[PDB]
Design an enzyme around this catalytic site. Structure first.
Site, short mmCIF file in Angstrom:
data_model
loop_
_atom_site.label_atom_id
_atom_site.label_comp_id
_atom_site.label_asym_id
_atom_site.label_seq_id
_atom_site.Cartn_x
_atom_site.Cartn_y
_atom_site.Cartn_z
N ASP A 110 -6.52 -25.98 8.05
CA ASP A 110 -5.40 -25.06 8.13
C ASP A 110 -4.83 -25.07 9.55
OD1 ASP A 110 -3.53 -23.33 7.19
OD2 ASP A 110 -4.90 -21.66 6.81
N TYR B 3 0.53 8.61 1.86
CA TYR B 3 1.46 9.63 1.41
C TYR B 3 2.92 9.18 1.41
CZ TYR B 3 -2.70 11.97 3.19
OH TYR B 3 -4.00 12.32 3.48
#
EC number: 5.6.2.2
Lengths: 717, 717
Positions: free
Chosen positions: B108, B367
């Site tokens: 990679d 939230y």
């Protein structure tokens, strides 16, 4: 003389100090909401402004050290509070710079209950009179808003119980949108303006009663058994009568806050570390298992760890971060000698780790793939009775179940351990020959010890033995006293003066073991080098001794009869200490003295579920037969044909209250379901308990699946 | 004398040292794979074992300081390497403890190219002769394995180009399963045994040539313009001729490795910080935008930040962690004066932050809810021409596009800034009255300056003006010299001796501004307290001066004509420095001297896409007309009816090579598509360029959407 994140009021500390209030915001997000509300200007003429109102932050705040907290010192400084003074009179309270302090915190577990609990405990510890006279107040924001189509005014509920009562008395919740606000940041801009338009109606005062004095000591400042006793019963939600009293006169008793908000936070922290004894997994692990079943329904395709981690967060409401999620997913798929899971949920594709680093050498989630062990899961956790389990609801959305009730107790058959500190938990897996013998004896009527085992349930005689699992362990398990010891295996080469370690203790990583030996100064005096030529899943450690040290090894460790001198010189023995701490399905902590108790406690839950499985199956078969009979005679839908998480009584009520070669196949299916109904009626009548024969059949399926998994390296291919 | 994570070979350092090899593993996961392979035992008699082979870890390793690296010192110690010695002869190389060192790293970007690049640079810097004589080697593991149903032997490719050539010559890739192994941890257990069965066939040697000497200096140790010149051209993949030469004789030139593996790592690090000038967003932000469109297709429902973050990771292949993902998602939805996005992708529901903390006071992702701004996105980024864009493929799966080509240049209309260090990037948004004037003049034939603008394209005359956006800024934008300055607004109360700051500079957070003033010792000598009574999205800062300090303010700052004394005493002015650094769509770095150049460079990409939009639309209309005509006469599918990411030539080839009141509606739809085809034929012939009228219509839609968004607070409700 300077306090960070503090904005003084115009009249703070002046002749109008008693009319001023200090808003103690939990964090920066809370401060932003307060600043928006306090500065609505002419849009809210009757609302609060920065006149007679100030802000302060409760960030961080995570006797001798309590007074040293900078945040707490800031609150004392801005309020004019002084120690060694008891505010028992109005004149003594008139010199404070603010009339009252209002805590603006989230209504979640890591909100009121922890931040507010410390604030209440801090005031109670030093100035109990302030709480009694109402100096400490709370801003109780709406928790649930229900929006109805065509109406711009929502219905606001400050408690979960109020919404449930309102929802029960509702004809149909189809055109109503329900939103949960567990934190101050969840309120939209228009909702904040509505909240501050009625600011005085959401300010609640704390009252100190006799019962709160003991609770403050138990929850805060007390690490003794008093806290443990309170945590063994679970959280009792406030009843409607208590809730109505709170809203009638806005005065919240301190005891009620501690019993509900603070206890829930304490239990939630434990639940993230201590598994439930029914399934032997925590809530985080249950989400992974529940998400795995949903993601891999048919889906016989490998998924990356981070790709699957995103699925769990999106669908099972996992908000603890991917770093903890990816680690938990990897541990659920690790399969090696000494791994935590003897029967991993997923199939390990790639390098998931090794026993040498104890699973810490797992590959990155970018390259590592995860596939569900469909054959094992479909048997241990049947999908047919997953509907009967209670389900956790997160903000009104269904989440992973409260607990799983597998065919066999996973809390006994897995190596459980709790890292960090607090509520030590250690489980050593029992072998899958004693577990099957115990369970089959309980279930099978024909078993010779079926009657003896049932009599032993009420007396805890424990006739059948339970022994630690020796699978993937080429060592020795010896029981001395009341403890089990696992011994490693070593080989001695006299000519080469080399000690070869062919096996380590049960749960000892190779790298950590070598480091432990290498840090022993006395041990290093006899050897010169340690070489780790061990393979994967097999130990081969070469210990090279000094030329004249082998004879001196046995002369120093005295050759104990319990532990060999080489097994003493090399730490090749460990005690199988068990800390059987578990969380009850209804909440709380339960202590088990032996593995028999855990199995005995798990049996009723599985036995009752089989009866519940058949009763719901018996009920749904009757409904579909009536539907099938009615249509054939002619020649509710979407519920009888497609049942869901509906109870026995709920299914009956809703089925009636509903609206409205090919023929040959319709007749054939009626005979099949009628025969199945007769089979179900033939069941739920057996001598031991309802559905005992079905349980025995599933045990064979589970055992066959485990045998196939063990024949491979838990690859099933 | 002790090296961590090092396992010496049996023959290392002995008479058989030259036959030994040292495997330099990138990390713990690489070490586990090597240990498994090196200990296959009798299962792989011809494979390598711990005889004549050792292991060492390259963990960490992130002249004066290079020799101080502990990991690099360990390699030198275990190999017996010594400085001040040139290994120009076989005898000098015979004293090394190992014959060669083999680097076992992932294939990679954060693998070979960075870890291997440093290892090659370290050897080239000190011992160039070792590379020439072949002391440094690489373990080239297979990159792509293609598994075919019914065959147990896969087809292995060591490069992406080899697979593409094989895939092109493949009749149908339906029964073949393609797997990408970008890291050593991705190989399954059976694949590792196959790899080590032919271990000698995957060991490649590095050769040092003349061209590699310059490249090593450019990439490593050189921060001058030499590195910048190499990074302005993009990555050129190895051709087939070079690849065949590498596999014919397993000797990899150092120059080829630097030009491909190392350059790609350098460009990837930049691409994560520097946006593309076509859409003004990085690859991480493109995944969020692409994921947002897919998640919110119809989906007019709010989603939590962490819930939506999981969707992006699962579907758009985001593996950089949720901490960076959630922060990027929040920034994409922030809308306040001075925010990075003037036209946010999402609709901010909850507390997404404020100008006071510069968006750092955003609520927790638990939230905070996120909703896509569907009306704005569907116009700025049309879904009809998203198929024509090139797409990034991650492990063979389609991901977010390489770039977006919006109707208007987002790289000019947004406040871009690059944190941290390296390749400074700062963009100040141009107002949406000069952008529309410039673009419409280019497109509209009837525009009076349409001819003048086109002549100005080739000469960069820049007839029309571009000015910084003053939206959500109640200050002053003054141009002095060649720089723009933004001035804050202040009010002075002589009677109260208070200076009120009613406006800050363009991108100055309130809290940081107060801290900057508070840290000025000279400034503090004139004032006594600063109170931040500012509201949300509005600045009101009270500065209380000393009783006799106002007159002394003007006497010290000299009342500069360019900047007022109060604007000098209070830092109410900032220079709008622009660092127009962008990444080209084909890869590399492009430098822009002015905002006109960015707009001029973006125009051809949008102009060509409209022609490509119509050409594909013209082609697909002909195919569906033929299909519609054929079925009507009677009275391929799934491709003509449902087109996908198919090119013009690919669509034609596959359409022919395919298999096989109600009637009234079939006739009606043929007339509609025939009329549309006539309309398309009427288009792509206009005087300025093909599809100019369509572009003008979309600009009006984009402008109308932006006006609606600005009328609200970007809520659209």
């Amino acid at each position: 003389v300077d306090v960070d994140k503090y904005t003084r009021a115009r009249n703070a500390g002046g002749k109008r100090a008693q009319d001023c209030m200090l808003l103690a915001a939990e964090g920066d997000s809370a401060l932003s909401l307060l600043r928006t509300g306090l500065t609505l200007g002419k849009s809210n003429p009757s609302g609060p402004s920065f006149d007679f109102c100030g802000m302060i932050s409760l960030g961080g705040v995570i006797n001798e050290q309590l007074t040293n907290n900078k945040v707490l010192q800031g609150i004392v400084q801005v309020l004019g509070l002084d120690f060694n003074c008891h505010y028992k009179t109005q004149e003594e309270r008139a010199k404070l710079r603010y009339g009252c302090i209002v805590a603006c915190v989230d209504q979640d577990l890591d909100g009121c209950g922890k931040i507010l609990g410390l604030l209440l405990a801090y005031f109670h510890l030093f100035w109990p009179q302030l709480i009694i006279h109402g100096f400490v107040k709370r801003l109780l924001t709406p928790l649930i808003r229900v929006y109805e189509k065509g109406k711009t005014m929502p219905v606001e509920f400050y408690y979960e119980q109020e919404f449930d009562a309102w929802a029960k008395k509702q004809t149909s919740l189809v055109n109503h949108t329900v939103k949960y606000y567990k934190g101050l940041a969840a309120h939209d801009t228009h909702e904040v303006k509505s909240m501050f338009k009625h600011f005085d109606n959401m300010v609640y005062t704390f009252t100190l009663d006799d019962s709160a004095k003991e609770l403050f000591h138990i929850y805060f400042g007390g690490e003794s058994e008093l806290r443990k006793r309170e945590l063994c019963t679970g959280v009792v939600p406030l009843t409607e009568t208590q809730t109505q009293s709170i809203h009638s006169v806005r005065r919240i008793p301190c005891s009620l806050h501690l019993q509900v908000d603070t206890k829930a936070y304490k239990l939630d922290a434990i639940e993230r570390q201590i598994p439930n004894f029914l399934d032997g997994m925590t809530r985080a692990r249950r989400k992974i298992l529940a998400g795995g079943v949903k993601c891999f329904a048919s889906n016989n395709r490998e998924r990356k760890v981070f790709q699957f981690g995103g699925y769990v967060a999106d669908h099972m409401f996992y908000h603890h971060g991917d770093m903890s999620l990816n680690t938990s997913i990897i541990k659920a798929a690790q399969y090696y000698p000494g791994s935590s899971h003897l029967y991993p949920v997923f199939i390990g594709i790639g390098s998931f780790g090794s026993r040498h680093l104890g699973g810490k050498d797992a590959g990155s989630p970018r390259y590592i793939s995860v596939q569900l062990a469909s054959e094992f899961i479909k048997t241990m956790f049947p999908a047919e009775d997953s509907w009967l389990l209670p389900y956790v609801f997160e903000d009104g959305q269904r989440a992973e179940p409260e607990y799983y009730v597998p065919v066999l107790p996973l809390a006994i058959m897995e190596y459980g351990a709790n890292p960090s500190e607090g509520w030590k938990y250690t489980t050593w897996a029992r072998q899958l020959e004693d577990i099957l013998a115990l369970v089959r004896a309980y279930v099978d009527k024909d078993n010779p010890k079926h009657e003896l085992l049932h009599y032993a349930i009420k007396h805890k005689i424990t006739i059948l033995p339970l022994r630690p699992s020796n699978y993937n362990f080429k060592g020795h398990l010896k029981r001395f006293g009341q403890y089990y010891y696992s011994y490693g295996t070593y080989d001695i080469s006299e000519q080469r003066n080399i000690i070869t370690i062919t096996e380590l203790p049960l749960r000892v990583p190779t790298v950590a073991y070598i480091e432990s030996i290498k840090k022993s100064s006395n041990r290093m005096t006899f050897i010169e080098e340690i070489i780790d030529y061990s393979s994967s899943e097999t130990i081969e450690i070469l210990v090279k001794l000094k030329p004249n040290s082998l004879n001196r090894i046995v002369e120093e460790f005295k050759e104990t009869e319990e532990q060999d001198s080489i097994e003493n010189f090399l730490r090749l023995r460990n005690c199988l200490h068990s800390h059987l701490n578990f969380v009850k399905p209804k909440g709380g902590i339960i202590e088990f003295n032996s593995y028999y108790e855990i199995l005995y406690a798990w049996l009723p839950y599985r036995r009752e579920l089989y009866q519940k499985r058949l009763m719901r199956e018996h009920a749904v078969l009757k409904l579909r037969i009536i539907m099938e009979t009615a249509i054939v005679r002619y020649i509710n839908h979407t519920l009888i044909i497609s049942p869901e998480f509906a109870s026995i009584e709920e299914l009956n009520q809703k089925a009636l209250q509903g609206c409205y070669a090919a023929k040959t196949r319709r007749v054939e299916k009626i005979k099949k379901m009628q025969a199945r109904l007769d089979k179900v009626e033939q069941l739920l009548q057996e001598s031991p308990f309802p559905g005992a024969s079905v349980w025995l059949e599933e045990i064979d399926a589970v055992e066959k699946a485990i045998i196939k998994g063990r024949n491979t390296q838990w690859k099933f291919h």
